[PDB]
UniProtKB/Swiss-Prot annotation:
Protein name per UniProt: Neuromedin-C
Residues recorded with modification Methionine amide: 10
Physiological role: Induces an itch response through activation of receptors present on mast cells, triggering mast cell degranulation.
Organism: Homo sapiens
Domain of life: Eukaryota
Gene designation per UniProt: GRP
Length: 10
């Protein structure tokens, strides 16, 4: 549902 920490997303 929610994206806590993808990787290279700001």
């Amino acid at each position: 549902g929610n994206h806590w920490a993808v990787g290279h997303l700001m």
